[PDB]
Amino acid sequence: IVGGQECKDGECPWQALLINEENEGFCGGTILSEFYILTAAHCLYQAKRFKVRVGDRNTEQEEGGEAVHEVEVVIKHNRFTKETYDFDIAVLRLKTPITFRMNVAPACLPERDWAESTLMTQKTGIVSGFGRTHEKGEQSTRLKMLEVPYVDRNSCKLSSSFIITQNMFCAGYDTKQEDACQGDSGGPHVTRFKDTYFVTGIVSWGEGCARKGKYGIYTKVTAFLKWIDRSMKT
Amino acid sequence: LCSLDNGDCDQFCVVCSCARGYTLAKACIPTGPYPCGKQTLE
Ligand SMILES: O=C(CN1C[C@H](NC(=O)c2ccc(Cl)s2)[C@@H](F)C1)Nc1ccc(-n2ccccc2=O)cc1F
Ligand SMILES: [Ca+2]
Ligand SMILES: [Cl-]
Ligand SMILES: [Cl-]
Ligand code: NA
Ligand code: NA
Ligand code: NA
């Protein structure tokens, strides 16, 4: 996350971190339930094998409430391809159930039609992760969050070198130096509606980080509510 | 109409719904200590 601020205790409890064979984070995820994590399909390509850490806010200190979970099953959208980055969604079923606690709780899944008219029309959402704090910089050792404005799809298409699909949406800032970044992919974009946070996006991609005239691109979770439901019942 | 004030529903919309970990009271009430989409307190 470029700009933004650190997540305090309990503030971003649905964050998950995918860790590679080096025990280093390389992508985020969103806790959906005791057994399921939402992430980006493209993340699955970027480690030989990986596990999930929940409850972490500082990767350099072991803190109360951190736990590690192995993945039993990966469910990757069959239509995902790096050619388009379209359908950038996967669900992970864990071997053992997550114990909810301080800093570990699920984000809500919205109902579809309601979500389109009610969530996707809000001014802003919140993205979080352990990614780089600058385009060419190092990954954050601290969990960060950032409020990002929803961006009009047409302005986003105009700004983009690549095709924006109906399974994506854009968020962030034209020139203000705040955005998600490398290492945040797969992580949560949540939208608050009356005291409750609903998962609305998966951090997917960007042309650099916080570039002038470029936005952040997110997988549109409302496009996949049925798919996610079927995956969590498999 | 949910068109105006979400039909007064705290969450989903008249008929109101809530996400898992909540029950319909209009309002939505947690059924446990860590309901979805709520920031956690010590
Ligand atoms: O490959 C990169 C490398 N970026 C990723 C990093 N940026 C990010 O991950 C993000 C910035 C903002 C958000 Cl949200 S996610 C940056 F540090 C360097 N970006 C990228 C650009 C374009 C696409 N893309 C988009 C559509 C079709 C093909 C295609 O390759 C995918 C991508 F991953
Ligand atoms: Ca830690
Ligand atoms: Cl499309
Ligand atoms: Cl790039
Ligand atoms: Na803060
Ligand atoms: Na809008
Ligand atoms: Na920008």
Structural overview:
In chain A, 9% of the residues lie in helices and 32% in strands. Chain A is mainly beta and 234 residues long. Chain A has 2 domains: 1-12 and 107-222, Thrombin, subunit H; 13-106 and 223-234, Trypsin-like serine proteases (Thrombin, subunit H), CATH 2.40.10.10. In chain A, the strands form 2 sheets. A 7-stranded antiparallel sheet of chain A has the order 6-5-2-3-4-8-7, with no helix packed on it. A 6-stranded antiparallel β-barrel of chain A has the order 9-10-11-14-13-12. Chain A is globular and about 45 Å long. Chain B has 42 residues and is mainly beta. Chain B has a single domain, classed as Laminin. In chain B, 0% of the residues lie in helices and 14% in strands. Chain B is built from no helices and 2 strands. Chain B has strands spanning 22-24, 28-30. Chain B has a two-stranded antiparallel ribbon. At the A-B interface, helix 1 and strand 13 of A face loops of B. The structure holds ligand LZG, calcium ion, chloride ion (2 copies) and sodium ion (NA) (3 copies). The PDB classes it as blood clotting. Keywords: hydrolase, cation, plasma, calcium, zymogen, protease, inhibitor, polymorphism, glycoprotein, gamma-carboxyglutamic acid, blood clotting, coagulation factor, hydroxylation, serine protease.
